[PDB]
Design a protein around this ligand. Structure first.
Ligand code: LEU
Ligand code: NA
Ligand code: NA
Ligand code: NA
Ligand code: NA
Ligand code: NA
Ligand code: NA
Ligand code: NA
Ligand code: NA
Ligand code: NA
Ligand code: NA
Ligand code: NA
Ligand code: ZN
Length: 866
């Protein structure tokens, strides 16, 4: 399997302008008839090369003439001797029931549905399966009426009929030209939640959410969130929906989260279905996020699409940015920002130091489904947010408007978007463009000096990006570096120089530079990299007192949280070293007192307090170190929790009781209170055992919502409380028939700190609620074990690695996309000690030798073993 390179992009030899599809649907054998109107742009002797995978070709016609000048090659149908313009007709057969990979047309329970992004449409018929080929689609679907009473595709229904033998048909038309990755088809029997939204200018849009029979009680929040997405896009970005109908279909078998197929989004049911007894606050907010995300793609992705897949971030980084702004505007901006930063520092930074490192706009790709990454998505969004930071909101929106004005109806590039932003704002983004082409995380080193004689404060800022596995050459970036200087009373010192205000976003563009501020009347405590203003590692020699001062005084909530993270980081590192020496946890009294102050400060937003009181995950902890000791990290996180639970016991219980709420509501103030309360409960669970057991079991049994029940159950597991087994069995007995709800329980099994967790996880492969056929089950058990139980996954005997090899041996053949997702923990081997590294290598070597190794795994394994 051969890499493709961005620099090899060339406009296509042929275009397709219109495609008429007919599906004669059956799960065992579907017959597809595709009639395309084509135009040659290249040389008269260049053949038409159509992509196709696992198709059974029945016939090829060119202007109704059966064609002889063609051949099939690996992954292609190559047609020679064509006129300049012509009708292509292909008939081919496919087999949805055999499609375990869930790419193309496949079966989800009794439904048939598609997933075409990135290169799935070629599993349906022979086509120019590349996103710079846009065409107007009409789609006729013919099927058994009892099995498939609903037959859906993109756009509007234009024709309908009934046939003999209990078959019927429906034809759809979508007036907007699209790349084929945005094609969708769904067939099945559903309950349908129907509603309407009227856009700002008066267009009435029929909203239809299709869910499995019996699930309509779990549909209203997703519908509500769609309507909120539509309104918000109008208010913030001035964008309205452009069709008559908006359909969403929730399917249980889906490799990823959700898909923005024009007018017919297809969602993993995990990001649709919610009721207060089945879904947590975090599920509600995830659903809101993802519904929004796919909606936002209607403009950033569909009305302007991608020229080639190396431009994926053009839509994904921008659309994540939009989903984050949506979430932030509707909810707590601080909490949104905190948690996006946790993901960047804790998961994205790890990718950017791994063998799979790539720039947000990749240069080389073997399997494009491997590049739906933290980097393309989350770091992509940080790059868009940097543009926002540099331009300001009004200029940013002018840029968005210029982008759409230039590129509406076409496929564009990352560079086109940056150019629009530059031209509309008159901000020079030439240097900035290097964020698109350079991989790895910049390290920004800051030193300071205060000169009491001149009242000048000098920051000396330096940057460098270390080399990564993919790029040996690195250069300085245009880093927007936001600061705020605090005096001894906690007030902001105005930033200025030579009598002029200075913008608080510093342009850090060189390897080294100095910034000098005047009229600095007191030695400042700085807030540096405010609101994580660039996706960089910050090296600054903070004192504990500067950090506790920020936790008390900083103006932005985010900076209060971030100061706490820097305070903890020091002691996390101390205590990992101590764990390796066999020593107890050491923590200064003044660090504990800082957290006591947060617990007792009645001015602090509970949402913020809750996040300060949520320790960094084991993934965020791992980013503090060059070589990761995952056992020491897990034990340190546990010991730090135990120490704070003891020290803060009375305060924790008082805050726990004070935030009790008898009504459950999905409302942001209520969520914040509950999050603080359950944060307190987490510490209490790790305190004196008897009290813990009582609090936790009572919360579980008395909870009137899944947030409170799960928080209690999760604490019982994490602290290994006496009540654990009984509560876990109760949840199983009550919820085993509900896969989404059981996913939570599988995650808690997989992430258990118990000594025999791997034995228990292996046994759960035979659980009544588990199946290797369902990506969500796989990810909640196997994936959570490998990815979120690094202490057990990285057990010294290598047992974790061998278990993952066994699972991947199956998944490599069954569902390579899910396999590739699950291999990630193994490809980080260079972060671990020599002995783990050798075992991880031997596991990778074994996988490399699989018969029929998928391209998905091959790409990652070869990078890892280099
Ligand atoms: C591969 C696709 C399911 C990903 C989708 N375009 C998203 O960003 O939500
Ligand atoms: Na020709
Ligand atoms: Na076209
Ligand atoms: Na799109
Ligand atoms: Na808000
Ligand atoms: Na996240
Ligand atoms: Na988020
Ligand atoms: Na593939
Ligand atoms: Na420029
Ligand atoms: Na200094
Ligand atoms: Na990490
Ligand atoms: Na089972
Ligand atoms: Zn997306």
């Amino acid at each position: 399997p051969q890499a493709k390179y961005r620099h090899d992009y060339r406009a296509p030899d042929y275009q397709i302008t219109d495609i008429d599809l007919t599906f004669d649907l059956d799960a065992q054998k579907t017959v597809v008839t595709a009639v395309s109107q084509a135009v040659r742009h290249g040389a008269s002797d260049a053949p038409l090369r159509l992509n196709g995978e696992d198709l059974k070709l029945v016939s090829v016609h060119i202007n109704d003439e059966p064609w002889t000048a063609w051949k099939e090659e690996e992954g292609a149908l190559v047609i020679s001797n064509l006129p300049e313009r012509f009708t292509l007709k292909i008939i081919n057969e496919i087999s949805p029931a055999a499609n375990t990979a869930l790419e193309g047309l496949y079966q989800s329970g009794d439904a048939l549905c598609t997933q075409c992004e990135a290169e799935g449409f070629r599993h349906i018929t022979y086509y120019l399966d590349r996103p710079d080929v846009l065409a107007r689609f009409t789609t006729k679907i013919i099927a058994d009426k009892i099995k498939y009473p609903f037959l859906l595709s993109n756009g509007n229904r234009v024709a309908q009929g009934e046939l003999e033998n209990g078959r019927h048909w429906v034809q759809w038309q979508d007036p907007f030209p699209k790349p084929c990755y945005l094609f969708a088809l769904v067939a099945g029997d559903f309950d349908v939640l129907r509603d309407t939204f009227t856009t700002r200018s008066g267009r009435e849009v029929a909203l239809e959410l299709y869910v499995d029979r019996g699930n309509l009680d779990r549909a209203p929040w997703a519908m509500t969130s769609l309507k909120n997405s539509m309104k918000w896009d109008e208010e913030r970005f001035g964008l309205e929906y452009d069709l008559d109908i908006y359909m969403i279909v929730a399917v249980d078998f889906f490799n990823a989260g959700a898909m923005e197929n024009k007018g017919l989004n297809i969602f993993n049911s995990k990001y649709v279905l919610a009721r207060t007894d089945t879904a947590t606050d975090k599920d509600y907010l995830d659903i809101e996020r993802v519904i929004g995300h796919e909606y936002f793609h209607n403009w950033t992705g569909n009305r302007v699409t991608c020229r080639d897949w190396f431009q994926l971030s053009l839509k994904e980084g921008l659309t994540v940015f939009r989903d984050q702004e949506f979430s932030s505007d509707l909810g707590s901006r601080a909490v949104n920002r905190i948690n996006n930063v946790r993901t960047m520092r804790g998961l994205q930074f790890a990718e950017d130091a791994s063998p799979m490192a790539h720039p947000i706009r990749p240069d080389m790709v073997i399997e494009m489904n491997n590049f739906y990454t933290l980097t393309v998505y989350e770091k992509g969004a940080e790059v868009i947010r940097m543009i926002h930071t540099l331009l300001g909101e009004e200029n940013f929106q002018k840029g968005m408007q210029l982008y759409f004005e230039r590129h509406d109806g076409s496929a564009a590039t990352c560079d086109d978007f940056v150019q629009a932003m530059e031209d509309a704002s008159n901000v020079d983004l030439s240097h900035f463009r290097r964020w698109y082409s350079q991989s790895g995380t910049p390290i920004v080193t800051v030193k300071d000096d205060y000169n009491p004689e001149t009242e000048q404060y000098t920051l000396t800022i330096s940057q460098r990006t270390p080399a990564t596995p993919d790029q040996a050459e690195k250069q300085p970036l245009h880093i927007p570096f936001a600061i705020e200087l605090y005096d001894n009373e906690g007030k902001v010192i105005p930033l200025q120089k030579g009598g002029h205000p200075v913008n608080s976003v510093l342009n850090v563009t060189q390897a080294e530079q100095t910034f000098v501020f005047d009229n600095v009347y007191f030695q400042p405590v700085p807030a540096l990299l405010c609101e994580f203003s660039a996706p960089v590692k910050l090296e600054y020699k903070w004192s504990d007192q500067q950090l506790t001062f920020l936790m008390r005084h900083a103006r932005n909530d985010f900076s209060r949280w971030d100061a706490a993270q820097s305070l903890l980081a020091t002691y996390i590192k101390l205590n990992v070293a101590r764990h390796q020496q066999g020593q107890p946890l050491s923590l200064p009294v003044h660090v504990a007192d800082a957290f006591r102050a947060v617990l007792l400060d009645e001015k602090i937003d509970p949402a913020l307090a809750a996040e300060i009181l949520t320790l960094p995950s084991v993934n965020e902890m791992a980013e503090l170190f060059d070589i990761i000791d995952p056992i020491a990290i897990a034990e340190v996180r546990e010991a730090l929790t135990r120490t704070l639970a003891t020290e803060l016991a009375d305060e924790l219980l008082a805050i726990y009781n004070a935030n009790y709420q008898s009504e459950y509501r999905v409302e942001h103030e209520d969520i914040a209170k509950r999050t603080l309360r359950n944060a307190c409960l987490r510490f209490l669970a790790f305190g004196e055992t008897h009290l813990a057991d009582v609090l936790v079991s009572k919360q579980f049994h008395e909870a009137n919502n899944m947030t409170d029940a799960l928080a209690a159950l999760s604490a019982a597991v994490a602290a290994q409380l006496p009540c654990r087994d009984a509560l876990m069995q109760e949840y199983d007995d009550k919820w085993h028939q509900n896969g989404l709800v059981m996913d939570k329980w599988f995650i808690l099994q997989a992430t258990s700190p118990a000594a025999n967790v791997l034995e228990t996880v292996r046994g759960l492969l035979q659980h009544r609620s588990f199946t290797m056929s369902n990506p969500n089950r796989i990810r909640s058990l196997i994936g959570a074990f490998a990815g979120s139980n690094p202490a057990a996954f990285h057990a010294e005997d290598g047992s974790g690695y061998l278990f993952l090899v066994e699972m991947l041996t199956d998944l490599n053949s069954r569902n390579p996309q899910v396999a590739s997702r699950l291999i990630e923990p193994l490809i980080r081997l260079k972060r671990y000690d020599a002995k783990r590294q050798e075992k991880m290598r031997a596991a990778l070597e074994q996988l490399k030798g699989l018969e029929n190794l998928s391209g998905d795994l091959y790409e990652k394994i070869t990078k890892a073993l280099a």
